[PDB]
């Protein structure tokens, strides 16, 4: 094998990724209220039951 190579192109894509920042969004509840929130969307909600009760299917 070989121990030499192109070390001058380390971090090629990370330094090349366009900088998109986090959008501001309302805070989620922490602790018990999150379990209250998650229980609502899964069991008492039928929003995504398309064929198999998907959780995050892609937009289609």
């Amino acid at each position: 094998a070989k121990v030499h190579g192109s070390l001058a192109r380390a971090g090629k894509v990370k330094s090349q990724t366009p900088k998109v920042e986090k959008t501001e969004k309302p805070k989620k509840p922490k602790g018990r209220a999150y379990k209250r929130l998650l229980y609502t969307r899964r069991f008492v909600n039928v929003t995504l039951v398309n064929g198999k009760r998907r959780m995050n299917p892609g937009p289609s």
Binding site: R32, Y34, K35, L38, R42, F43
Partner: protein, 184 residues
Amino acid sequence: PRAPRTYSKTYSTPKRPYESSRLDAELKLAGEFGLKNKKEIYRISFQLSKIRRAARDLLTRDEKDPKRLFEGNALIRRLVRVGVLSEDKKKLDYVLALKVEDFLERRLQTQVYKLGLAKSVHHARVLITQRHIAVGKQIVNIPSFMVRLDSEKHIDFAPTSPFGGARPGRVARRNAARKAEASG
């Protein structure tokens, strides 16, 4: 130097982390009983295992064995006092398969919701932790109390707390404070 302090763990995680048949069941128990973690269910199942372990070790022993009867009576009585076990099932064979949520429903979380005055389990969890509860004559703010069938009629609002008189309320007090000064 001094004697060591004895401490013990009170819960155990399941062997398989991601299994859907149990993952959704866990969210069911935490769903309508207002629990913030799986460790509440994990905690309950730990001494549920310990209760079954003690009960299984009793049935192995011969009938009329003094050790079988003594801790058999103690175990059967101590759960009956808590109320997780009905009076009819006092045979030491129905304690093996009691339920997983029988212990949980005896908590002060549920009792405040059962006996009115909370109108939702999520409101109750606040009510206990907000220090407006008197299970006896004493204020308690621990949602897991395991009421003992001798104090169910004794849950009432603490005398030194709103909704029980003897004070109007903290935020209500400053609420009228603007009302008095604005009228002048």
